[PDB]
Design a protein around this ligand. Structure first.
Ligand code: NA
Ligand code: NA
Length: 324
DNA sequence: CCGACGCGCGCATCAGC
DNA sequence: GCTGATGCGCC
DNA sequence: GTCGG
């Protein structure tokens, strides 16, 4: 809570910019500000003190002065009591309702969850499933539930084909106390960049046979997005439903994907800006050499995560320590 | 001053032909 | 019927 | 909104 009142404000402003204003660069500007402020180790006492930080400019500085002198933000107080704006903001908390659907709904008088319940006919399939599990989807997932979840995912995936490789990435892979969802990266030997896609459906189908996956938000041939729920012990309170994603990557790109999706995020930007001060370009799929021109060669065979630690030649930095 | 800002990705849905 | 654009939720 | 060419 050193600067919590300031970051809460910047994050509040950010959400309104994303959801009501539909100004995504302001959203990220506000969130960037909140990030550098949350990590600044002093109780900020002035907008001017703040403006020294990268991502804090004049306007956010002035907003801090008003916050620090009066407790509040006039613009925020006003927006907060504003029925149209705050309804739009709120409906975006329904998964499948982004800022356009929420603008559309608040135009036609749908402002609340109940209003959606009375107009299910006007929600696509994703939105219905977001509305149904609205509460569950806002709970975090404790690491201990992630382990049981990961037990089921790996058990069943090896059950369909012992040659599948599955990895749970996300902050969970780095050891997090809790997770917001489960991101599962899938691969098979029979799936290369130069390849046949039957493999995702087989795994989704097995996880629905054991009633682990309960609903389907979107499915294709390389990405699945849906809902899962741990089995209850018959007598106990039933676990909340959880968001789950499963990505079928090719094998020659898999460990690039594992690294990318594991992260953490800013770990990778260091990992990448400081990747090419060495001569091997990196993204999410491949590591490719460059030349004095700057055009890429052809990517060299990463078949374990740690050949991105040979090609750029860092030592071992495991899931654990990739905080940045 | 004025554009960049994830030099972003898979899938579901809509606008349009 | 199709393509391309736009909406969406994410590491 | 903040940065930088
Ligand atoms: Na600054
Ligand atoms: Na939403």
């Amino acid at each position: 809570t050193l600067n919590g009142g300031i970051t809460d404000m910047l994050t509040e402003l950010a959400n309104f910019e994303k959801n009501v204003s539909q100004a995504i660069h302001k959203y990220n500007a506000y969130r960037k500000a909140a990030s550098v402020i949350a990590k600044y180790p002093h109780k900020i006492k002035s907008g001017a003190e703040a403006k020294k930080l990268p991502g804090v400019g004049t306007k956010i500085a002035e907003k801090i002065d008003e916050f620090l002198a009066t407790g509040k933000l006039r613009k925020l107080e006003k927006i907060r009591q504003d029925d149209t704006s705050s309804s739009i903001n709120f409906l975006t908390r329904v998964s499948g309702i982004g800022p356009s659907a929420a603008r559309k709904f608040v135009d036609e008088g749908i402002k609340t969850l109940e209003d959606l319940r009375k107009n299910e006919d006007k929600l696509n399939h994703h939105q219905r499933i977001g509305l149904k599990y609205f509460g569950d989807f806002e709970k975090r997932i404790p690491r201990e539930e992630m382990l049981q979840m990961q037990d089921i995912v790996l058990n069943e995936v090896k059950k369909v084909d012992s040659e599948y490789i599955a990895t749970v990435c996300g902050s969970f892979r780095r050891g997090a106390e809790s997770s917001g969802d489960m991101d599962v990266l899938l691969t098979h030997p029979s799936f290369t960049s130069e390849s046949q896609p039957k493999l995702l459906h087989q795994v989704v189908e097995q996880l629905q046979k054991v009633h682990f996956i309960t609903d389907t938000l979107s499915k294709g041939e390389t990405k699945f997005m849906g809902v899962c729920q741990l089995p209850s012990k018959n007598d106990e309170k039933e676990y909340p439903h959880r968001r789950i994603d499963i990505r079928l990557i090719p094998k020659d790109q898999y460990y690039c994907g594992v690294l990318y999706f594991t992260g953490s995020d800013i770990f990778n930007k260091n990992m990448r800006a400081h990747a090419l001060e060495k001569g091997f370009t990196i993204n999410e799929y491949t590591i490719r050499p460059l030349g004095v021109t700057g055009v890429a060669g052809e990517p060299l065979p990463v078949d374990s995560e740690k050949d991105i630690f040979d090609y750029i030649q860092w030592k071992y930095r495991e899931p654990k320590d990739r905080s940045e």
